[PDB]
Amino acid sequence: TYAVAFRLERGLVFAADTIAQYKKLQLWRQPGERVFVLLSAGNLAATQAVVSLINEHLSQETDDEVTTLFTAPNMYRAARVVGDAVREARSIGFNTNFIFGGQIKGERPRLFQIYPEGNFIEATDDTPFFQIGEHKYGKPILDRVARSDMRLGEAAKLMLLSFPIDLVIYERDTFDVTREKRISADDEYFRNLSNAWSDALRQAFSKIEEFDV
Amino acid sequence: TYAVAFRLERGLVFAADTIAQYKKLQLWRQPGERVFVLLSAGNLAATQAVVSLINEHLSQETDDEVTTLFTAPNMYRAARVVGDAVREARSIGFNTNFIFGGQIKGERPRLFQIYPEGNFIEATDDTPFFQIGEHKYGKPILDRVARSDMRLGEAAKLMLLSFPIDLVIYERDTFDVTREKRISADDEYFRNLSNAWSDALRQAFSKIEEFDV
Numbered sequence: 211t212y213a214v215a216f217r218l219e220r221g222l223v224f225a226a227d228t229i230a231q232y233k234k235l236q237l238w239r240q241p242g243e244r245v246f247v248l249l250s251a252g253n254l255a256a257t258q259a260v261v262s263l264i265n266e267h268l269s270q271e272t273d274d275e276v277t278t279l280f281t282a283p284n285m286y287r288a289a290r291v292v293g294d295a296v297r298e299a300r301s302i303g304f305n306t307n308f309i310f311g312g313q314i315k316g317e318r319p320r321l322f323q324i325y326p327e328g329n330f331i332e333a334t335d336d337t338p339f340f341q342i343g344e345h346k347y348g349k350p351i352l353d354r355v356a357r358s359d360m361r362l363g364e365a366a367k368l369m370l371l372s373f374p375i376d377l378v379i380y381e382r383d384t385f386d387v388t389r390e391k392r393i394s395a396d397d398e399y400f401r402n403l404s405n406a407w408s409d410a411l412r413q414a415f416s417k418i419e420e421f422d423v
Numbered sequence: 424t425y426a427v428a429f430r431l432e433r434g435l436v437f438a439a440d441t442i443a444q445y446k447k448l449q450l451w452r453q454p455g456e457r458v459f460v461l462l463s464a465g466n467l468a469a470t471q472a473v474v475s476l477i478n479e480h481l482s483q484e485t486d487d488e489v490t491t492l493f494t495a496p497n498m499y500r501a502a503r504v505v506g507d508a509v510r511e512a513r514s515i516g517f518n519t520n521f522i523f524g525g526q527i528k529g530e531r532p533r534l535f536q537i538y539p540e541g542n543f544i545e546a547t548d549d550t551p552f553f554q555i556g557e558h559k560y561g562k563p564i565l566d567r568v569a570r571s572d573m574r575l576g577e578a579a580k581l582m583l584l585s586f587p588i589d590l591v592i593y594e595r596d597t598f599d600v601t602r603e604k605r606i607s608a609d610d611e612y613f614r615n616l617s618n619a620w621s622d623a624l625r626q627a628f629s630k631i632e633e634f635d636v
């Protein structure tokens with residue numbers, strides 16, 4: 211499977227293609243305080259194991275000094291929580307990266323890519339997106355076109371062209387995921403967008419074939 | 424590694440990134456009679472083994488009924504020769520596809536994709552190109568933009584944007600490979616082409632973001 215996420219000035223956008231715990235886009239929320247999204251591209255067993263470890267600590271942790279998603283004071287600390295779950299899930303496709311993002315009150319929205327051993331890197335304005343899965347579809351186009359000042363809707367359109375897809379748009383400082391949408395191949399808007407993209411690409415190539423190589 | 428080839432009305436274009444027998448683009452020729460190009464994306468040992476088997480039969484075959492690249496009456500028969508070498512090389516990265524194309528006098532230029540067991544498919548006007556390697560870079564762009572009536576130079580430009588690269592252009596009915604070029608990352612023409620492509624893509628996206636999804 212394939213998933214992708216963008217960090218913009220205005221917020222975060224998450225997308226993944228596709229039984230709740232095995233779902234490739236996972237959401238956690240405390241109203242007005244914190245929101246988190248995990249994207250997976252690994253096999254079903256790997257996704258479930260990581261989510262189960264996160265939820266085990268949210269639901270049953272007795273030690274107050276252990277950090278969970280709901281006690282993490284910032285998104286770096288929250289990413290370490292997921293990193294620990296990703297590493298520990300190896301005890302429970304199996305060696306794919308995860309994407310984790312969200313926002314905690316008092317701090318900007320942040321986005322991370324988590325590796326098999328629980329280490330991670332964070333999205334920057336220079337590198338505002340991550341892709342995970344067997345094939346990072348349309349990476350060259352995202353590299354050339356993605357910008358951190360893009361509106362959330364236009365980022366979503368670019369992401370959808372790189373690919374049913376679960377799409378989540380998170381607006382900065384809202385601490386809720388309201389804009390949640392499932393888009394199938396039979397969606398007429400998405401088909402219309404893809405048709406226009408193909409037309410625009412052919413026109414784009416017709417311009418640049420002026421140049422020699 | 425990555426390689427790609429196009430079959431056009433005007434001829435064939437081959438490209439591969441990169442010690443002669445391990446080279447990822449391999450050429451055979453009989454002047455004015457036949458030309459062949461093999462592209463590999465597998466490991467070094469796999470490429471050498473296939474080429475060695477092809478050359479063994481060209482150089483040492485004593486049985487006249489055994490088909491070689493130089494006795495094949497048509498390109499389908501020549502593809503079977505390579506297919507046999509690809510399958511037999513498994514006895515000698517290891518499970519990647521090959522691309523094989525060329526022309527024999529009395530017949531149009533033809534292009535094939537060879538699978539690990541020696542079976543193959545042929546390029547058509549509807550599907551005029553093949554890609555091989557770990558990552559089929561820029562497949563969505565080739566799918567949307569590639570056309571069988573493209574000039575050889577414009578096909579080459581499109582192929583180069585999907586990626587030092589060894590580029591071969593074969594013009595129909597010539598039975599020679601004269602237009603052979605090695606293009607590095609420091610090539611100013613290729614850099615200029617890539618810069619313009621990025622600019623054109625951003626402009627292309629700016630047009631199509633009119634549409635909703």
Ligand code: NA
Pocket residue numbers: 357359
């Ligand atoms: Na900009």
Ligand code: NA
Pocket residue numbers: 570572
């Ligand atoms: Na056309």
